[PDB]
Amino acid sequence: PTWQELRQFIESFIQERLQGKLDKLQPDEDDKRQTLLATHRREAWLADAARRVGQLQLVTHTLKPIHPDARGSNLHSLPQAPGQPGLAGSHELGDRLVSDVVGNAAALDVFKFLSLQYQGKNLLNWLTEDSAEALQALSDNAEQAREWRQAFIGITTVKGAPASHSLAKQLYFPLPGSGYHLLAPLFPTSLVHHVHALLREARFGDAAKAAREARSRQESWPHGFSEYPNLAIQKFGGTKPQNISQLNNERRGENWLLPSLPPNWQRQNVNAPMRHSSVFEHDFGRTPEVSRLTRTLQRFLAKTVHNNLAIRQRRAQLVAQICDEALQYAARLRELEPGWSATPGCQLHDAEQLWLDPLRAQTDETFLQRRLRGDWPAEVGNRFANWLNRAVSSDSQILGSPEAAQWSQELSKELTMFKEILEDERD
Amino acid sequence: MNAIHIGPFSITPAARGLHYGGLPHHQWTLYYGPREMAIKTLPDSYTSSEVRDEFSDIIAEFVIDARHRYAPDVLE
Amino acid sequence: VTDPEALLLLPRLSIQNANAISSPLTWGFPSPGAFTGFVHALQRRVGISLDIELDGVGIVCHRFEAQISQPAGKRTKVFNLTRNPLNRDGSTAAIVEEGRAHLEVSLLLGVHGDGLDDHPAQEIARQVQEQAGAMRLAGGSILPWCNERFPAPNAELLMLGGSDEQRRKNQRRLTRRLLPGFALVSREALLQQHLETLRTTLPEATTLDALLDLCRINFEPPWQVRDKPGWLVPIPAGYNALSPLYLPGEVRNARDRETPLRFVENLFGLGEWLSPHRVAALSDLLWYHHAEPDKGLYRWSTPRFV
Amino acid sequence: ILSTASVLAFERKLDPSDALMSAGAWAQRDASQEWPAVTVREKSVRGTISNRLKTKDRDPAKLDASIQSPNLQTVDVANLPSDADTLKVRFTLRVLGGAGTPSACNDAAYRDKLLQTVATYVNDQGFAELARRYAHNLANARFLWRNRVGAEAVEVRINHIRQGEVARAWRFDALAIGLRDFKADAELDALAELIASGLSGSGHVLLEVVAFARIGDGQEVFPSQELILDKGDKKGQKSKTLYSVRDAAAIHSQKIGNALRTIDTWYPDEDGLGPIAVEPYGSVTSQGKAYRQPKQKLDFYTLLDNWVLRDEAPAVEQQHYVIANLIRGGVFGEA
Amino acid sequence: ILSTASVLAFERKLDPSDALMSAGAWAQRDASQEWPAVTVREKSVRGTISNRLKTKDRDPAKLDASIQSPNLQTVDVANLPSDADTLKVRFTLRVLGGAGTPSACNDAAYRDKLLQTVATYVNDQGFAELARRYAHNLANARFLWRNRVGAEAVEVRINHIRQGEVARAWRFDALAIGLRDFKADAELDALAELIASGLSGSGHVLLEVVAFARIGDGQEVFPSQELILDKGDKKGQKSKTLYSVRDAAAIHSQKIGNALRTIDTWYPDEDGLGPIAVEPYGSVTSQGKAYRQPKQKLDFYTLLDNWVLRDEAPAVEQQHYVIANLIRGGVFGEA
């Protein structure tokens, strides 16, 4: 409201900076105190700040995370909210926006001179309006106030020509009718800082650590937690993260990338089940994916029926995943030897061996090539269905009610699909 | 440094220090009385909170095993 | 934007050092925009001479290996780097952390045009395969399968089937060819409905938080894990406008002074990896460009999926 | 006025695959398709302090206290098996066409001038000397690096794969062909003709390069060491890590490319080393010194602006160096 | 002023392999290529209190309380079978040569001066005493560290492998050749000449060294032992882990190298202990005390900075020590 309290606050700020640099320098002689107070104690420091606001730039998307010998145009722009559904971005950052600072590592003090809360609001939004308390609290003269306001508000607007350096990325995009756009991307350091802050609360917050301790104590808690596995660290500054930006000095490197990985990103090995009796209960069932699927079926089998059919839809989808993995198992059985099924052995699951090794029809001209064609083995999934019958809960309440009927119906449908898949293996 | 006492638990280091990697290290030992449960090599740059958090998983596992081992009987 | 008249199966392609950092927020499998741009570069280089159009790519990703390591004492991971050459004064240059990945993917390409009636299917298939064998897919060289046991040619299958059963058998055989992999599809509808579910759970929740909730493992107190419909990776869903579309000669140090440049920001969506037998047709897996250049929104998606 | 393009980038021509390393016996190199791969294992080392002291810890008490604390590391080691004295290193090389064609260029006039300069280079002498030196660096197994140092016999087999079959098989004695002399041979000239036709062509030329080194039985092979930054973490890590693809030791593609590009014998410093890798500002990482400095008129950038803009065509050796940089690639262009 | 280089990295000459240990019988050691390898099995130990107390638990009550409840461990143990008395240890040594040339050097003039220094050494006194002591350390089985301390009879067979065939065979009684006296023998002089030809670069020398030691039926053998960071309880109190490559006990290559480097008999202290391993600041971890400290002007770094930088040539035995350090290799050089 009053200009006098803003003047008192900025004089207190420059006095705090003066006593801080006096304590840091610790000078007792050589006239260092007079030279320190001759440039950071009066309005001329604000004039000195006029030499510092033109060097700094307040941005939300910068180019300096891309190769640091590139000099482009870092721009502060909030992207428009897309009309298409189901996709995010930096447009989702509304009032939860932190604006990055780029420039010298010594002018950055004036950033807090643009980020104080004197009247209860940020001073950049105070200087974007022609307020009555504005242009009098910092300058007695009108024209000095106007040029100081223009220089102090120019930290948001992009300086120089619109430019992207050669070391920056530029990627052509095909237009629908006969065109291209060059589309240079910038690093969303505000969005990355927001995601890194959310991950900090998720992994090292007090409530998250309390929920982790409650999980470790196996007790109840009013809220849950998360883990965020397989995170990747991408440090931008090698030894000087302050040279990248101020937000990259807050989080020193550590881009904290999310694991967008395919399910076969941790392919262990391919193994041939030689001296074993059944593939589904001894080798295929011990893989961790179908292990989590079978524990999920065990959890979903003994449950209430209030969301039943919807849960059953999920259950149907769940059971589909398991037979998918069975095909996936057969898929990596295409990566093995052509004739592993013809090796000697007392028990090697010969009922499943017509589907386990499809390439032995190349090995044997008529000993076993015509056997898979004439037999058309599709009953093996029924054996797998028997293994899937070990994935259900041993509850008599499901058998008494129609839950077992729905389970048998979706099981019959999915193994009908599995048997139809296994039928046309000869093509 | 010195032992970390968490209830009946004592995290005591070996007096000898090794140099695993290039950084100095110490072999920290977790005892529940006379029985040790986890001997782990930890850096000398670790604070007491980090040494506590290294053995906190085994501490919580032993607490869970003690809860599930000496649980009282249930009448229905 | 159109139904393909044919589907061309580029086989197992071993991409050597692909860009593992797909996005400023995600790492791992590369962007689908890289695959769509590769198919458009294939159409730009050899598609026009064959009188065909190549739009829409379905990714299978038969193998993935990340050049990463897990440091001791941390549950996160770091990227293995390459030693760049020294500067002119003999000192080590500043390191830009770039991650690499060895991929093995097979691509379904949507082919439409009169040239399908002008050439044999194996001829245009072999031409686009030998063009693609000297290109790049996500920043990595393509290993063109020299001196192994049995090389894999393409199989261009015409989607204009004479009968529904023959078309079904063709699609099932083409799915059987690309079996040890996972189709990566776009899930804008699933992410939007999960955003609505979270907004009913708690208001003023952004799409970023709904995307994050569909990727982290949520632990619920009675301690179980909140399940997910699929793999539900966070993918780069395209590019949104960050600047007005400047003139082709306006932007300094552009790639070319004939293409207009516009500064963009990455768009993040939800993708799903599925077993490819769980789709009605293999043309649903095709990733299509969608520009909408008046409003930014330079997206890639899988239209006609469900 | 023919200003330089502000972005100017070239593809990696001669892009190799990762050099897969396996083990076997000499005179069984014909049936090397079933050779078991070299696996990278872990082992522990307890060394003692042997680095230079900076005259503050040279007192006997502190030095004895430092020795009394045991220095330990974990190292990734790759060894041959104790019944396999031969290391087989196999990779695939794609000689790409359009060697002088840049990926990106701002000015159309600069692109036309650069294409005309490269076209005059092919019309004058072609890629014949450069592909001769590339075929030399394929012919001796410089890509084996430290696997080449103490080997009894190194033999390189290079197979041209046209469609799906070996179109032409070259066999070279890698030890007879020196690491520093680029002589003339008939098989080497045929390989040079194939690589130069691949560089001058429109598609690509595919080669399979296999090198058998008789290092010794059970000896230590040297794959590429992975560059992993410790990043100032508190927990001690393994000091040495190696590179593998799938339980199979390998060399990085950039190391094989650096060995293939070690053809530059025209730098203004004395050739006591011999050839160096073709780099802008002639950087050699094994020396810590950069030859072909821009204060002399023999760095790649000033040679390109003299050859293209001001039409000051340099000597034939420096033209070979410039086109070897163009085949090498790189990201150029002033701001 | 000829300052020393910041990097002076040297490669390792006399490259050893992981010495695999198998088991067998004496007088059947001629046919020992089929001998089964020693397996690293597991056993459990109950550890009583046998260490010094810290003057706080010395009370009888807490001591008896700790003794009443002792601590159990699982140890990896390597033993011979109960019908096999002879331990066989096999490794291949690779004598490279070019010991004066460093792999990396920041200063070219310092590299030239070091090359001239090593060349003047070789012209004056070549690799004759050094190779004699290396042949001594191969002849006695010092690479059997604790497999030699109570062995009844040790025999070392060294075969020069040329083109996959044995060029020359040596058979030494390793107990007659002491661990401290460097005497002369005609076969040992022939092996010294072979290692001299390998180190001078005049030939490629690979040796297969097989040591047979009579320890006893079922006796515990001592391979290399790994560091264990975490014992825990998921791993059943794993206190000792021995080294093995594929179900086969083995010694580390650097342990064989340290046993081969034990040639340094010229440290300023008394030679009543005998030779020590060649290292900068002559450090012995078992003794815990540095022979050739930097204070007494006889360590490797001051002798190298006198011999090369200031042309102050040391004594003949001390320059033997310096060239033995150059053969050993390291990361010599400041920061």
PDB file of N, CA, C and O in Angstrom, chain C residues 182-207:
ATOM      1  N   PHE C 182       6.209 -56.560 -28.138  1.00  0.00           N
ATOM      2  CA  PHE C 182       5.044 -55.895 -27.571  1.00  0.00           C
ATOM      3  C   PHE C 182       4.699 -54.677 -28.412  1.00  0.00           C
ATOM      4  O   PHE C 182       5.539 -53.794 -28.604  1.00  0.00           O
ATOM      5  N   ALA C 183       3.468 -54.627 -28.906  1.00  0.00           N
ATOM      6  CA  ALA C 183       2.995 -53.449 -29.615  1.00  0.00           C
ATOM      7  C   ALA C 183       2.847 -52.279 -28.651  1.00  0.00           C
ATOM      8  O   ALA C 183       2.226 -52.408 -27.591  1.00  0.00           O
ATOM      9  N   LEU C 184       3.433 -51.144 -29.018  1.00  0.00           N
ATOM     10  CA  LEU C 184       3.347 -49.919 -28.235  1.00  0.00           C
ATOM     11  C   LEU C 184       2.267 -49.036 -28.847  1.00  0.00           C
ATOM     12  O   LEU C 184       2.373 -48.636 -30.011  1.00  0.00           O
ATOM     13  N   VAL C 185       1.230 -48.741 -28.064  1.00  0.00           N
ATOM     14  CA  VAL C 185       0.069 -48.003 -28.541  1.00  0.00           C
ATOM     15  C   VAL C 185      -0.139 -46.783 -27.653  1.00  0.00           C
ATOM     16  O   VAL C 185       0.409 -46.680 -26.556  1.00  0.00           O
ATOM     17  N   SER C 186      -0.963 -45.862 -28.144  1.00  0.00           N
ATOM     18  CA  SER C 186      -1.274 -44.626 -27.442  1.00  0.00           C
ATOM     19  C   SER C 186      -2.594 -44.770 -26.696  1.00  0.00           C
ATOM     20  O   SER C 186      -3.535 -45.398 -27.191  1.00  0.00           O
ATOM     21  N   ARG C 187      -2.656 -44.183 -25.503  1.00  0.00           N
ATOM     22  CA  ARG C 187      -3.750 -44.368 -24.551  1.00  0.00           C
ATOM     23  C   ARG C 187      -4.258 -43.026 -24.045  1.00  0.00           C
ATOM     24  O   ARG C 187      -4.288 -42.767 -22.840  1.00  0.00           O
ATOM     25  N   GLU C 188      -4.605 -42.130 -24.974  1.00  0.00           N
ATOM     26  CA  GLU C 188      -5.165 -40.833 -24.596  1.00  0.00           C
ATOM     27  C   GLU C 188      -6.499 -40.982 -23.874  1.00  0.00           C
ATOM     28  O   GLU C 188      -6.779 -40.249 -22.918  1.00  0.00           O
ATOM     29  N   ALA C 189      -7.338 -41.924 -24.318  1.00  0.00           N
ATOM     30  CA  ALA C 189      -8.633 -42.135 -23.678  1.00  0.00           C
ATOM     31  C   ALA C 189      -8.479 -42.694 -22.267  1.00  0.00           C
ATOM     32  O   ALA C 189      -9.178 -42.260 -21.343  1.00  0.00           O
ATOM     33  N   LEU C 190      -7.557 -43.646 -22.083  1.00  0.00           N
ATOM     34  CA  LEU C 190      -7.317 -44.221 -20.761  1.00  0.00           C
ATOM     35  C   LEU C 190      -6.719 -43.193 -19.806  1.00  0.00           C
ATOM     36  O   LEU C 190      -7.117 -43.123 -18.638  1.00  0.00           O
ATOM     37  N   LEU C 191      -5.778 -42.377 -20.293  1.00  0.00           N
ATOM     38  CA  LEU C 191      -5.184 -41.335 -19.461  1.00  0.00           C
ATOM     39  C   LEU C 191      -6.204 -40.260 -19.105  1.00  0.00           C
ATOM     40  O   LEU C 191      -6.217 -39.766 -17.972  1.00  0.00           O
ATOM     41  N   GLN C 192      -7.082 -39.904 -20.050  1.00  0.00           N
ATOM     42  CA  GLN C 192      -8.116 -38.915 -19.765  1.00  0.00           C
ATOM     43  C   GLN C 192      -9.138 -39.438 -18.762  1.00  0.00           C
ATOM     44  O   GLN C 192      -9.544 -38.708 -17.849  1.00  0.00           O
ATOM     45  N   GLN C 193      -9.548 -40.705 -18.890  1.00  0.00           N
ATOM     46  CA  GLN C 193     -10.515 -41.240 -17.934  1.00  0.00           C
ATOM     47  C   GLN C 193      -9.880 -41.478 -16.566  1.00  0.00           C
ATOM     48  O   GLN C 193     -10.561 -41.349 -15.542  1.00  0.00           O
ATOM     49  N   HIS C 194      -8.573 -41.753 -16.516  1.00  0.00           N
ATOM     50  CA  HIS C 194      -7.894 -41.838 -15.229  1.00  0.00           C
ATOM     51  C   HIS C 194      -7.722 -40.459 -14.606  1.00  0.00           C
ATOM     52  O   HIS C 194      -7.759 -40.326 -13.376  1.00  0.00           O
ATOM     53  N   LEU C 195      -7.560 -39.427 -15.439  1.00  0.00           N
ATOM     54  CA  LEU C 195      -7.555 -38.052 -14.953  1.00  0.00           C
ATOM     55  C   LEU C 195      -8.910 -37.665 -14.370  1.00  0.00           C
ATOM     56  O   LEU C 195      -8.976 -36.999 -13.331  1.00  0.00           O
ATOM     57  N   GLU C 196      -9.999 -38.079 -15.024  1.00  0.00           N
ATOM     58  CA  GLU C 196     -11.335 -37.830 -14.480  1.00  0.00           C
ATOM     59  C   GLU C 196     -11.567 -38.602 -13.185  1.00  0.00           C
ATOM     60  O   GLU C 196     -12.215 -38.093 -12.262  1.00  0.00           O
ATOM     61  N   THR C 197     -11.041 -39.829 -13.100  1.00  0.00           N
ATOM     62  CA  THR C 197     -11.152 -40.614 -11.873  1.00  0.00           C
ATOM     63  C   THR C 197     -10.391 -39.962 -10.720  1.00  0.00           C
ATOM     64  O   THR C 197     -10.889 -39.909  -9.588  1.00  0.00           O
ATOM     65  N   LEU C 198      -9.192 -39.439 -10.993  1.00  0.00           N
ATOM     66  CA  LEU C 198      -8.456 -38.713  -9.960  1.00  0.00           C
ATOM     67  C   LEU C 198      -9.113 -37.386  -9.608  1.00  0.00           C
ATOM     68  O   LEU C 198      -9.049 -36.966  -8.449  1.00  0.00           O
ATOM     69  N   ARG C 199      -9.745 -36.717 -10.578  1.00  0.00           N
ATOM     70  CA  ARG C 199     -10.442 -35.467 -10.283  1.00  0.00           C
ATOM     71  C   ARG C 199     -11.679 -35.709  -9.428  1.00  0.00           C
ATOM     72  O   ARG C 199     -12.052 -34.859  -8.612  1.00  0.00           O
ATOM     73  N   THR C 200     -12.336 -36.858  -9.608  1.00  0.00           N
ATOM     74  CA  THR C 200     -13.376 -37.250  -8.662  1.00  0.00           C
ATOM     75  C   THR C 200     -12.774 -37.622  -7.311  1.00  0.00           C
ATOM     76  O   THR C 200     -13.391 -37.390  -6.266  1.00  0.00           O
ATOM     77  N   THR C 201     -11.575 -38.211  -7.315  1.00  0.00           N
ATOM     78  CA  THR C 201     -10.891 -38.515  -6.060  1.00  0.00           C
ATOM     79  C   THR C 201     -10.402 -37.241  -5.376  1.00  0.00           C
ATOM     80  O   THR C 201     -10.626 -37.044  -4.176  1.00  0.00           O
ATOM     81  N   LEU C 202      -9.737 -36.361  -6.126  1.00  0.00           N
ATOM     82  CA  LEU C 202      -9.263 -35.092  -5.584  1.00  0.00           C
ATOM     83  C   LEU C 202      -9.243 -34.025  -6.677  1.00  0.00           C
ATOM     84  O   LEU C 202      -8.668 -34.241  -7.751  1.00  0.00           O
ATOM     85  N   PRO C 203      -9.871 -32.863  -6.451  1.00  0.00           N
ATOM     86  CA  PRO C 203      -9.930 -31.838  -7.507  1.00  0.00           C
ATOM     87  C   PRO C 203      -8.591 -31.171  -7.793  1.00  0.00           C
ATOM     88  O   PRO C 203      -7.580 -31.496  -7.160  1.00  0.00           O
ATOM     89  N   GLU C 204      -8.606 -30.229  -8.750  1.00  0.00           N
ATOM     90  CA  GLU C 204      -7.479 -29.488  -9.333  1.00  0.00           C
ATOM     91  C   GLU C 204      -6.238 -30.342  -9.598  1.00  0.00           C
ATOM     92  O   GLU C 204      -5.105 -29.880  -9.426  1.00  0.00           O
ATOM     93  N   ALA C 205      -6.442 -31.573 -10.056  1.00  0.00           N
ATOM     94  CA  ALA C 205      -5.352 -32.477 -10.394  1.00  0.00           C
ATOM     95  C   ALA C 205      -5.056 -32.367 -11.882  1.00  0.00           C
ATOM     96  O   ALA C 205      -5.961 -32.493 -12.712  1.00  0.00           O
ATOM     97  N   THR C 206      -3.792 -32.125 -12.212  1.00  0.00           N
ATOM     98  CA  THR C 206      -3.393 -31.947 -13.596  1.00  0.00           C
ATOM     99  C   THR C 206      -3.247 -33.299 -14.291  1.00  0.00           C
ATOM    100  O   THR C 206      -3.278 -34.362 -13.664  1.00  0.00           O
ATOM    101  N   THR C 207      -3.083 -33.244 -15.616  1.00  0.00           N
ATOM    102  CA  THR C 207      -2.860 -34.456 -16.398  1.00  0.00           C
ATOM    103  C   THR C 207      -1.483 -35.052 -16.119  1.00  0.00           C
ATOM    104  O   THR C 207      -1.283 -36.260 -16.298  1.00  0.00           O
TER     105      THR C 207
END
